Amino acid sequence: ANTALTITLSTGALLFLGRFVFLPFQRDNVSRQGLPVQNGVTHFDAGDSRAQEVTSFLKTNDPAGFTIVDVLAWGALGHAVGFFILATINNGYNPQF
Amino acid sequence: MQDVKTYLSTAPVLATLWFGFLAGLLIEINRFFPDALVLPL
Amino acid sequence: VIGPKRGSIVKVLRRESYWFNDTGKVVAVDQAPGVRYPVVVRFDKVNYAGVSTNNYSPDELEQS
Amino acid sequence: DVAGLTPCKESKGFAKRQKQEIKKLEGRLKLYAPDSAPALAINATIEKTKRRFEFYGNQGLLCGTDGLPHLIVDGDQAHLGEFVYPGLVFLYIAGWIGWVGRAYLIDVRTSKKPTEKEIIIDVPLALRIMSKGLTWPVAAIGELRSGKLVEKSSNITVSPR
Amino acid sequence: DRPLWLPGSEAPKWLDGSLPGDYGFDPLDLAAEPGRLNWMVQAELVHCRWAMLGAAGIFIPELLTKIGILNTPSWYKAGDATYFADQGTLFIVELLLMAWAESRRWADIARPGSVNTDPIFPNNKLTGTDVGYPGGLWFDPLGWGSGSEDKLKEIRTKEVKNGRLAMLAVLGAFVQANVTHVGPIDNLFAHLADPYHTTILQSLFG
Amino acid sequence: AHSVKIYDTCIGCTQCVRACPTDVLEMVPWDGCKASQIASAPRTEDCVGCKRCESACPTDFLSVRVYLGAETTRSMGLAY
Amino acid sequence: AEWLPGNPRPSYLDGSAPGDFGFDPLGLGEVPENLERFKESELIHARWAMLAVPGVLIPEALGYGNWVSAQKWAATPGGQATYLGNPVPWGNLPVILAIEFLAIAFAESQRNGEPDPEKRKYPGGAFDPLGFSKGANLEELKLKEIKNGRLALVAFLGFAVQAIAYPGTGPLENLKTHLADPWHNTIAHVIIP
Ligand code: CLA
Numbered sequence: 091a092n093t094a095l096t097i098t099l100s101t102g103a104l105l106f107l108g109r110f111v112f113l114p115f116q117r118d119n120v121s122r123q124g125l126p127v128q129n130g131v132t133h134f135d136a137g138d139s140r141a142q143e144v145t146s147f148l149k150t151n152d153p154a155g156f157t158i159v160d161v162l163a164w165g166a167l168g169h170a171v172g173f174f175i176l177a178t179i180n181n182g183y184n185p186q187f
Numbered sequence: 188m189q190d191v192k193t194y195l196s197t198a199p200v201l202a203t204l205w206f207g208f209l210a211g212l213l214i215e216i217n218r219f220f221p222d223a224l225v226l227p228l
Numbered sequence: 229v230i231g232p233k234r235g236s237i238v239k240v241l242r243r244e245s246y247w248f249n250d251t252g253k254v255v256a257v258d259q260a261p262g263v264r265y266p267v268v269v270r271f272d273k274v275n276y277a278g279v280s281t282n283n284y285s286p287d288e289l290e291q292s
Numbered sequence: 293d294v295a296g297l298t299p300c301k302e303s304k305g306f307a308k309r310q311k312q313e314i315k316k317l318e319g320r321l322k323l324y325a326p327d328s329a330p331a332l333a334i335n336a337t338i339e340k341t342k343r344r345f346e347f348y349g350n351q352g353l354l355c356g357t358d359g360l361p362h363l364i365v366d367g368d369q370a371h372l373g374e375f376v377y378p379g380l381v382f383l384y385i386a387g388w389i390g391w392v393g394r395a396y397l398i399d400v401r402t403s404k405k406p407t408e409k410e411i412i413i414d415v416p417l418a419l420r421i422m423s424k425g426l427t428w429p430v431a432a433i434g435e436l437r438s439g440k441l442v443e444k445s446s447n448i449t450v451s452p453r
Numbered sequence: 454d455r456p457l458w459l460p461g462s463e464a465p466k467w468l469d470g471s472l473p474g475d476y477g478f479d480p481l482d483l484a485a486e487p488g489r490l491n492w493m494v495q496a497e498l499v500h501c502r503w504a505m506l507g508a509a510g511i512f513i514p515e516l517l518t519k520i521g522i523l524n525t526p527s528w529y530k531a532g533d534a535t536y537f538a539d540q541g542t543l544f545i546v547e548l549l550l551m552a553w554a555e556s557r558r559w560a561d562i563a564r565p566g567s568v569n570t571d572p573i574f575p576n577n578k579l580t581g582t583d584v585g586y587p588g589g590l591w592f593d594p595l596g597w598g599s600g601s602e603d604k605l606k607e608i609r610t611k612e613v614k615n616g617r618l619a620m621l622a623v624l625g626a627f628v629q630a631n632v633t634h635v636g637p638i639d640n641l642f643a644h645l646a647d648p649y650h651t652t653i654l655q656s657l658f659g
Numbered sequence: 660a661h662s663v664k665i666y667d668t669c670i671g672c673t674q675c676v677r678a679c680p681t682d683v684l685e686m687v688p689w690d691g692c693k694a695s696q697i698a699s700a701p702r703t704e705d706c707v708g709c710k711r712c713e714s715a716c717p718t719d720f721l722s723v724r725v726y727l728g729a730e731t732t733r734s735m736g737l738a739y
Numbered sequence: 740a741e742w743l744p745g746n747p748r749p750s751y752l753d754g755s756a757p758g759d760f761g762f763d764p765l766g767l768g769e770v771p772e773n774l775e776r777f778k779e780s781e782l783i784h785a786r787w788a789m790l791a792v793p794g795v796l797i798p799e800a801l802g803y804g805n806w807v808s809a810q811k812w813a814a815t816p817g818g819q820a821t822y823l824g825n826p827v828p829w830g831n832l833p834v835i836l837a838i839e840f841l842a843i844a845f846a847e848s849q850r851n852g853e854p855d856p857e858k859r860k861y862p863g864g865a866f867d868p869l870g871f872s873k874g875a876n877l878e879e880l881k882l883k884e885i886k887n888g889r890l891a892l893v894a895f896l897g898f899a900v901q902a903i904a905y906p907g908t909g910p911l912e913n914l915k916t917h918l919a920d921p922w923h924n925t926i927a928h929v930i931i932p
């Protein structure tokens with residue numbers, strides 16, 4: 091089994107899924123849920139200096155709003171899928187149903 | 188007899204009579220149908 | 229008048245009462261301006277202290 | 293066989309227990325004269341034990357390791373006589389008792405002095421209530437469907453929350 | 454007033470007496486609750502019908518077999534017999550067809566005057582005045598009922614009484630075939646031959 | 660010492676004052692009942708916490724309420 | 740009415756909707772928006788079952804096996820899936836399933852993102868290349884759709900329950916068996932053996 095080809099294909103497939111078919115759904119759900127709130131107000135508004143959203147790291151120029159954190163998340167999912175595929179192919183386990 | 192019947196209708200006397208009748212019934216049943224673990228049918 | 233008629237059947241809305249959601253008979257209602265609990269209610273069953281009557285304001289009693 | 297249990301007819305432990313109990317009774321018997329009343333009592337014991345063990349064998353009871361009948365209460369058709377049939381009989385009797393008691397309470401809440409009726413039971417009223425327990429399940433279903441079985445939550449005393 | 458089941462006793466308030474087959478018999482108060490009597494009337498009607506059919510199918514065939522003409526197996530051994538169809542398959546077809554019939558009957562009971570028309574052919578209208586007697590071309594072709602005279606009663610009383618007798622007869626056949634392991638007609642002849650040593654006492658305890 | 664409170668449900672029967680073994684409660688003029696009086700606890704520092712006043716109150720739930728606490732010298736009922 | 744003559748209809752099911760026969764014994768449609776979601780889900784389920792039934796009957800009728808054994812290649816290592824006898828060169832386990840996931844995710848996402856419930860049930864437009872919406876027979880066509888759809892839904896449930904009942908057998912073979920001995924081989928073999 092080709093490790094590079096499988097990893098690349100899975101990562102690209104899941105990045106495409108997260109960028110084109112699931113990006114609006116994820117955006118709608120994060121808009122609906124919003125920032126976690128402590129009691130009426132957000133954690134940062136309650137006085138938590140370490141709960142402030144990192145705007146500098148979340149800045150992006152992708153026209154659809156795809157962020158580097160989203161890139162990391164979808165790439166992690168893709169790598170997980172690819173390594174699952176590679177481990178199952180290079181397994182030798184045949185249930186023979 | 189009204190007062191005697193009223194006394195005999197009190198909770199403890201009626202409980203004694205009813206439970207004694209039940210105990211006699213169960214004891215006689217066990218006399219004629221003893222040591223059964225399974226209901227035969 | 230102040231509250232329910234004499235002898236009427238009334239249901240108690242006081243949550244802390246022993247007779248919440250229970251029916252009683254009105255005995256007397258006092259028309260004196262200033263009395264806070266003028267309605268007198270008799271009950272068929274006693275409470276833990278052994279009392280079978282109490283006083284309620286008309287706003288915590290409903291008609292059956 | 294229903295959890296590795298052999299039938300008690302061909303259970304060696306069951307027969308061993310038969311033999312041991314009969315032998316113990318006969319040993320107790322040897323010290324009494326044949327015509328004596330204790331001898332008659334012990335012989336009646338022996339006959340009772342023999343018939344008990346024959347009855348247990350004839351109903352296909354399941355004996356485990358050694359001789360001890362074990363009861364199957366999973367609903368198996370071959371063992372309905374152990375729990376399902378007597379269970380139903382119990383349910384009929386218990387429901388009878390409860391239903392007639394409830395009926396009596398209902399019929400004495402309309403009396404002028406119900407407490408006196410509870411400490412001093414109205415035997416004629418109680419007996420004609422008890423007679424109604426023959427068809428108790430039908431009455432229970434009728435009251436459940438009509439709505440006269442269960443009191444509405446709005447008329448039941450509850451504590452503050 | 455009409456005769457009662459117990460002379461000198463008072464009929465229940467909910468047995469008005471106008472109902473066919475009324476005798477004041479309700480000592481356990483099974484129909485006291487208003488609106489429950491009609492359901493019991495329907496149940497008794499159907500039990501009567503099935504019991505009369507059952508008695509005519511249990512006693513007449515065995516009586517004819519004893520006579521000699523139309524020999525048939527015993528009713529309790531009739532189930533374990535070879536047929537053109539499997540017993541289980543027959544049971545399922547029976548359940549489905551009776552489901553249709555009894556669902557129509559249930560719809561009639563739950564609301565009178567709603568299921569008197571054929572679904573497939575709207576023109577046909579099997580209309581009956583009272584619940585329990587579906588008058589029309591089916592179930593009444595001779596026209597012997599269907600409100601021929603006001604206050605039918607008598608014929609309805611005949612049917613309820615014969616059905617009550619049929620229910621008791623079928624229960625007796627069931628129980629005494631479970632006990633004696635003998636056909637009902639043979640039981641009758643055994644009783645008619647030696648009435649004083651073949652009875653209930655000498656079948657359960659002798 | 661303990662905290663004793665009186666509520667407007669009181670009917671001025673005075674039965675809580677008579678049951679008090681340390682003279683904590685007293686009846687004062689009032690206009691919220693037929694009796695034209697209400698119980699009061701001006702000297703709760705002498706209260707021991709027996710709640711005998713609670714047992715003597717006839718209202719459904721108590722118009723006089725004792726809440727306990729502190730447990731000072733007078734509260735513990737110590738003669739030494 | 741309809742599903743049971745004379746039966747009073749629930750208030751939330753007036754009868755104007757296609758296939759609305761008032762059948763709701765459990766009262767699942769009491770909440771209006773849940774009822775609209777149920778309409779959409781019923782239509783989707785029915786369309787999938789409609790499209791599924793020929794994909795179960797035709798391959799068995801043509802000698803390519805039944806639907807239960809249609810995945811039997813994937814169970815064996817190196818199944819080498821086939822189509823009309825011809826093997827599929829790209830029919831290994833780790834590519835067709837990924838293609839399914841991506842393509843169906845695309846179609847499912849495009850469908851999920853349309854606000855109007857009427858277009859969530861009957862989109863039309865690019866989905867009607869042969870018209871069939873300019874005429875006045877549209878509503879009865881919806882009724883026919885839902886009628887064949889529920890019929891196919893029950894048909895596929897029958898396929899599944901018969902697959903459990905007689906493993907290794909196809910629905911059409913079960914039909915042949917019924918035609919052979921209609922009075923010995925029925926559902927009674929399963930529920931009352
Ligand atoms: C909840 C626990 C429990 C249970 C389930 C049992 C169950 C049993 N015990 Mg045990 N027992 C218990 C507690 C229990 N006991 C306790 C606490 C003690 C210490 C006091 C004993 C001491 C004890 C002894 C010493 C004996 C039993 C025996 C029995 C058996 C039969 C008793 C009997 O009278 O049957 C006979 C059957 C009846 C009385 C039938 C009921 C009749 C009523 C009137 C109904 C009438 C018919 C009805 C109206 C119609 C119904 C429908 C119809 C179709 C049938 C039975 C297996 C006896 C036995 O045989 O051992 C196996 C026995 O010798 N037990």
Ligand code: CLA
Binds near residue numbers: 475
């Ligand atoms: C299951 C059959 C069945 C049903 C549904 C009814 C229903 C009815 N009967 Mg009918 N009846 C029946 C059987 C039945 N009966 C039989 C077999 C007899 C002959 C004994 C009678 C004789 C009879 C008379 C004389 C009268 C009625 C009346 C009534 C009505 C009174 C309400 C009531 O209590 O019935 C409800 C009954 C039931 C729900 C059935 C209860 C079954 C119990 C639980 C078990 C049965 C006992 C036992 C196990 C079997 C018998 C043992 C055997 C040794 C005798 C009602 C319409 C009265 C009426 O209003 O006239 C129209 C009336 O006057 N019936």
Ligand code: CLA
Binds near residue numbers: 786881884888
């Ligand atoms: C017989 C079932 C049936 C019926 C009556 C309808 C009826 C309707 N559909 Mg529905 N639909 C069905 C099945 C059906 N559809 C299935 C199975 C699918 C999934 C593919 C869809 C997907 C679908 C969508 C996505 C849309 C509709 C729309 C419509 C409406 C306009 C089109 C029309 O008149 O269809 C007429 C249908 C026929 C005349 C059936 C003819 C059968 C053909 C020839 C195929 C049969 C071939 C073969 C046997 C099966 C193999 C499958 C093949 C594709 C390979 C109308 C209410 C549109 C709508 O309402 O918007 C306004 C719309 O947007 N339908």
Ligand SMILES: CC(/C=C/C=C(C)/C=C/[C@@]12O[C@]1(C)C[C@@H](O)CC2(C)C)=C\C=C\C=C(C)\C=C\C=C(C)\C=C\[C@@]12O[C@]1(C)C[C@@H](O)CC2(C)C
Binds near residue numbers: 500532621623
């Ligand atoms: C007796 C009976 C019910 C009796 C009920 C009674 C007395 C109830 C009495 C009470 O409630 C009342 C009235 C008033 C209450 O206040 C008091 C009590 C006292 C409680 C029903 C019989 C009901 C009798 C029925 C249903 C008979 C059905 C027969 C069938 C199905 C036959 C099938 C056979 O088919 C044949 C015909 C052909 C064969 O070859 C094969 C097979 C299959 C074996």
Ligand SMILES: CC1=C(/C=C/C(C)=C/C=C/C(C)=C/C=C/C=C(C)/C=C/C=C(C)/C=C/C2=C(C)CCCC2(C)C)C(C)(C)CCC1
Binds near residue numbers: 101165173
């Ligand atoms: C520039 C650009 C572009 C492109 C880009 C790209 C292509 C990117 C990519 C990116 C990527 C591609 C990313 C990724 C990421 C990933 C990640 C982040 C992952 C992670 C993972 C993990 C963490 C894993 C783990 C594991 C495994 C699974 C195995 C071993 C074990 C463990 C568990 C450790 C273009 C041309 C279109 C144009 C536009 C812009």
Ligand code: SF4
Binds near residue numbers: 710
């Ligand atoms: S608790 Fe005792 S001392 Fe205190 S006020 Fe009540 S009765 Fe008086």
Ligand code: SF4
Binds near residue numbers: 698
């Ligand atoms: S508190 Fe209770 S006992 Fe004391 S005066 Fe008021 S009502 Fe009477």
